Design a protein around this ligand. Structure first.
Ligand SMILES: [Cl-]
Ligand SMILES: [Cl-]
Length: 164
């Protein structure tokens, strides 16, 4: 198991524009297009991202390419973030993947706001951090996915993703 496989399980793969859990236009493997309520705005962002007139539909290769870019961007945002970087450096390989997952889903800013959980993770207080992470809108709105990430942080293994 690795970050790519992990996120592919959490986000799924859709080749036509769709609305995510928050109702935002998205495509591929969780690639957010726009928070705007307009399909046109979404189609236009898609074309700009792919480099062609797509008509709201892309191929698998195109989806994977956006995915690669997005993971890279997520890692780069963590490393550039003063609050995130120290946490990430302190963690093992499996838990790093869970932090990337969260950044991919909610953005650097969002994650950087979990101050208390971040400090617990850096301290290696696994159970405590897991309880604190669950007290969030994130867990209440997408509980199954949040549970998977939280279990990951708690155990340092891929058990939550094994079977999926
Ligand atoms: Cl892009
Ligand atoms: Cl969920």
């Amino acid at each position: 198991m690795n970050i790519f496989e992990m996120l592919r399980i959490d986000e799924g793969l859709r080749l036509k524009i769709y609305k995510d859990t928050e109702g935002y236009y998205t495509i591929g493997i969780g690639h957010l297009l726009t928070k705007s309520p307009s399909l046109n705005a979404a189609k236009s962002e898609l074309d700009k991202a792919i480099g062609r007139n797509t008509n709201g539909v892309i191929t698998k290769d195109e989806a994977e390419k956006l995915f690669n870019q997005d993971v890279d961007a997520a890692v780069r945002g963590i490393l550039r973030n003063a609050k995130l970087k120290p946490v990430y450096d302190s963690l093992d390989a499996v838990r790093r993947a869970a932090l990337i997952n969260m950044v991919f889903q909610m953005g650097e800013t969002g994650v950087a706001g979990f101050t208390n959980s971040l400090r617990m993770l850096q301290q290696k207080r696994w159970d405590e951090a897991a309880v604190n992470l669950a007290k969030s809108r994130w867990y209440n709105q997408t509980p199954n996915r949040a549970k998977r990430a939280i279990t990951t942080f708690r155990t340092g293994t891929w058990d939550a993703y094994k079977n999926l």
